[PDB]
Amino acid sequence: HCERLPYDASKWEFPRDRLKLGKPLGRGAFGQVIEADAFGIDKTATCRTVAVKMLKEGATHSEHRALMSELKILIHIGHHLNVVNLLGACTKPGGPLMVIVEFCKFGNLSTYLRSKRNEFVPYYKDFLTLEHLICYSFQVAKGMEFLASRKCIHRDLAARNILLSEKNVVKICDFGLARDIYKDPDYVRKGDARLPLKWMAPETIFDRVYTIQSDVWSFGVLLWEIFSLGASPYPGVKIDEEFCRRLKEGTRMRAPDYTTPEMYQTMLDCWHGEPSQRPTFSELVEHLGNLLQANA
Numbered sequence: 001h002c003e004r005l006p007y008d009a010s011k012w013e014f015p016r017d018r019l020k021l022g023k024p025l026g027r028g029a030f031g032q033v034i035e036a037d038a039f040g041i042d043k044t045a046t047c048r049t050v051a052v053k054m055l056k057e058g059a060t061h062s063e064h065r066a067l068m069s070e071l072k073i074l075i076h077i078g079h080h081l082n083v084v085n086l087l088g089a090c091t092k093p094g095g096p097l098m099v100i101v102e103f104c105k106f107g108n109l110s111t112y113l114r115s116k117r118n119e120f121v122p123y124y125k126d127f128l129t130l131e132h133l134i135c136y137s138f139q140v141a142k143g144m145e146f147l148a149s150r151k152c153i154h155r156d157l158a159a160r161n162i163l164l165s166e167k168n169v170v171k172i173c174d175f176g177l178a179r180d181i182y183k184d185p186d187y188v189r190k191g192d193a194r195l196p197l198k199w200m201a202p203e204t205i206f207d208r209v210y211t212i213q214s215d216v217w218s219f220g221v222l223l224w225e226i227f228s229l230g231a232s233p234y235p236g237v238k239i240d241e242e243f244c245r246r247l248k249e250g251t252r253m254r255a256p257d258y259t260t261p262e263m264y265q266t267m268l269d270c271w272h273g274e275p276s277q278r279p280t281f282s283e284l285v286e287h288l289g290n291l292l293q294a295n296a
């Protein structure tokens with residue numbers, strides 16, 4: 001019910017003429033994220049690279065409403081290291097709605113990890129290591145625990161919606177309308193929708209129920225993506241009625257190439273058939289914290 005939420009223009013509004021729009025970072029049918037240079041958005045009189053979401057030719061007022069509600073929910077959520085943070089917005093009539101968040105130098109985590117297969121050692125400068133992988137996992141759990149604390153759920157948690165910034169900081173985001181879900185193989189036709197089926201819990205697939213505990217299922221798939229170094233889930237499996245049936249039956253992915261035994265058990269835990277029996281994000285934070293320390 002985001003339509004009832006506040007937008008405080010005195011706090012968030014940023015002049016469109018102080019934004020210099022650059023190259024696209026992601027394009028969907030109706031939306032896009034573009035790299036931009038912003039003058040003084042978060043520090044007095046200093047230029048800052050940012051990411052701005054706005055609509056595209058083809059969009060209608062209903063996409064505009066959805067983008068406005070995205071802005072309001074980002075205000076409600078507030079700041080945490082492990083979520084992409086809102087820096088401002090352009091909402092003034094006469095120009096397009098723009099939602100401005102921090103820029104994350106390395107882009108999405110799925111693409112990034114997939115590029116590091118020849119630059120990974122379990123235990124070489126700028127090589128990824130097992131510690132990196134556990135560290136990213138822990139950070140995303142911290143960010144999700146934070147989102148849950150705000151009574152929000154993600155609904156599209158996946159490595160493609162995690163960004164890598166400087167100093168090995170990862171941030172949860174959602175490309176949303178700025179992803180071409182009609183051309184993206186990760187989204188599969190189900191009725192009138194294109195859904196991220198490989199990341200979805202059985203209750204979401206079958207009952208269209210979304211909760212924080214269904215986000216936990218997705219987090220388990222995210223873990224598999226991290227510890228496969230950006231591989232595509234359910235390798236060599238057609239995503240159809242048979243896939244969904246077997247998932248309800250209890251079929252799970254095998255251990256990915258770069259996992260530890262306890263990381264794989266954590267994936268299986270997140271994939272409990274019973275939502276209430278999956279760990280919470282708070283439990284995951286504690287566990288991943290211990291695993292990180294054990295690695296060190």
Ligand SMILES: CNC(=O)c1ccccc1Sc1ccc2c(/C=C/c3ccccn3)n[nH]c2c1
Pocket residue numbers: 025026033050051052053070084099100101102103104105106107108163172173174175
């Ligand atoms: C919930 N809404 C959002 O997450 C959101 C809001 C406003 C603007 C964008 C986003 S999502 C997003 C997507 C990509 C980014 C990037 C960087 C992308 C990048 C960087 C290098 C190479 C390729 N891509 N930084 N920040 C981003 C935020």
